[model samples]
Target: KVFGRCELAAAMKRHGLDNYRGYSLGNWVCAAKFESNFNTQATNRNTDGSTDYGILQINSRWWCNDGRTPGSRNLCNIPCSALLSSDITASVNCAKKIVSDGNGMNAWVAWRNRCKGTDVQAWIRGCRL
Candidate 1:
């Protein structure tokens, strides 16, 4: 399950940061795990019965504005957020912003703490910047 999504990983590679940009694969994976367990098909339910979707949990509505394959699936890749969202540049930049804040890995240490009981080290161990 390491870097499980080929398309996304490929996207990263295409964007010049498949494995490690400002952070390492672990950092990205850790954020992904913390955000949505790396599930591209994941969705959240609203009280009105509406739905949200995708790995970064980018929300189907925001993604639908673009043409991401799965409209209701939250896989859209809009230009505005594409570079600020989950594509590749955005992922690297965002992670860099976080790391630059001086949190280092400790900022994500909470995720490790949360998954520690289950032996999940995608954030705390496998990949370190």
Candidate 2:
């Protein structure tokens, strides 16, 4: 499922990604824009023999068990495929745990690359809070 910008904003807000771990809702929106383009079924294989899954592009090497990535920690304790559902509960839960796991949102390359220190609030401009 592909989400409109404000649609995603509303969804993420409901899931408490807004200001979760001190990250603004716009930060998550910006990261999701670059990470998965707001697509629920997004997946990307990394050069390190791991894959990122779902809207957050969560890493298989640490957060999820794809059953194919070597040395998977599976900290989220669910199949990577769980992140692909249009119902984003599992994905958002994993994001919460990932943030709490000490890395914060820096676990996401997209956040570091594009969302960090930017005017991320503009990503949700015109969207209701």
Top TM-score hit: 2
What are the lDDT scores of the predictions, listed in order? 0.44, 0.93
Model 2 C-alpha RMSD to native: 0.9
Residue 24's lDDT within candidate 2 is 91
- Per-residue lDDT of candidate 1, residues 75-126 (tens digit): 2334323432343454444444444555554444544565334543334442
TM-score of each: 0.38, 0.96
Question: Candidate 2 has what TM-score?
Answer: 0.96
Clashes of 1: 1
lDDT score at residue 100, model 1, on the 0-100 scale: 50
The pairs that clash in candidate 2 are none
